[PDB]
Structure 1
Amino acid sequence: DWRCARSMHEFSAKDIDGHMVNLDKYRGFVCIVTNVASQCGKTEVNYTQLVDLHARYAECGLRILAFPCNQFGKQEPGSNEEIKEFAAGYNVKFDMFSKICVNGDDAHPLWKWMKIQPKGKGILGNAIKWNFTKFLIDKNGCVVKRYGPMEEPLVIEKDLPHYF
């Protein structure tokens, strides 16, 4: 059960093309996991800065897992195919997943799990508050920090390992 898991690597998720991804493929990599939306006021800053971080740190082992989610103002209403083409317009080369829920009983189990981790706790409760919450995940799959919807992705850069 998701509650008993100790690492992101115990989970799987469908990517935006429908391929089932075992998240153990991220073992050994530092990851940013984020819920995305195409129709949010911070869509541009988040996509552009995530693409910039990936360009600068993929060769150090940074990976980015983007989960579309329509739970926040109906700001991700499109199909998975439309969302894939949208991300391609920002030159995304990181990993896009199929649309999910992040809150409530239908939330994807990875997201249920991240929200209860010691470093995954929110500033005022654990629910994801809006589009573009970010979790930094260490090479062992543990949550190391959470960044809310108003945090630009570039704020995560200082928190990456000293070897990056």
Structure 2
Amino acid sequence: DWRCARSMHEFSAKDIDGHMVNLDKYRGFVCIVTNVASQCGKTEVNYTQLVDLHARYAECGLRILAFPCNQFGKQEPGSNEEIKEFAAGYNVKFDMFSKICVNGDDAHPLWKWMKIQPKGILGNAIKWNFTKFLIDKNGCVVKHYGPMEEPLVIEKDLPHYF
């Protein structure tokens, strides 16, 4: 059961092209896992800064896993094909996944698990688009950045985990 997972690496997810991806392929890499939307007021700053972080630190082992999610103001209403094209407009080269739920019993189990990494049981629901979890090379959640935090806030924390 997902509650007992020790690492992101125990999970799998469908990429935005529909193919199952074993997330243990990220073993040895530092990852930013984020829920994205195309019609949010935060969309422009988040895509632009995620692409910038990936441009400068991918060669060092930074990977970004982006999960579309329509649960926050219905701001990701498009199909996966439409979302893939939207991300291409920002020159996204990191890893896009198929649209999921991040809250609810139908939420992707990776998200169920990340939300409980330390703490209390109440109030761990994802609050809006563009929450960011930082994942170390062993697949552990080491930081959470709320949807108010611009991605470039993360840059200063990266050296502790590379």
Q: TM-score range by the shorter chain?
A: over 0.9
| Secondary structure at the counterpart of residue 38 of structure 2 | coil
| Secondary structure at the counterpart of residue 136 of structure 1 | strand
After TM superposition, which residue ranges in structure 1, 4 or more long, deviate above 4 angstroms?
Answer: 121-124
Q: 1:163 to 1:14 in 2, by over 3 A?
A: closer
| Secondary structure at the counterpart of residue 145 of structure 1 | strand
Q: 1:153 to 1:124 in 2, by over 3 A?
A: farther
What is the rounded CA distance, in whole Å, between the counterparts of 1:122 and 1:107 in structure 2?
19
Which of 150, 156, 159 does residue 158 from structure 1 map onto? 156
Q: 1:163 to 1:31 in 2, by over 3 A?
A: closer
Contact 2:137 2:161 in 1 (8 A): no
CA drift of 1:104 comes to: 1.0
What is the rounded CA distance, in whole Å, between the counterparts of 1:123 and 1:40 in structure 2?
28
Contact 2:136 2:161 in 1 (8 A): no
Task: Structure 2 unaligned segments of length 5 or more: list them.
Answer: none
Q: 1:124 to 1:44 in 2, by over 3 A?
A: farther
* Pairwise CA RMSD: 1.7
Once the two structures are aligned, what percentage of the paired residues are identical? Answer: 99
CA drift of 1:125 comes to: 2.0
Task: Structure 1 unaligned segments of length 5 or more: list them.
Answer: none
What is the rounded CA distance, in whole Å, between the counterparts of 2:33 and 2:77 in structure 1?
20
With normalisation by structure 2, the TM-score equals 0.96
Q: 1:44 to 1:36 in 2, by over 3 A?
A: same
Count matched residues.
Answer: 162
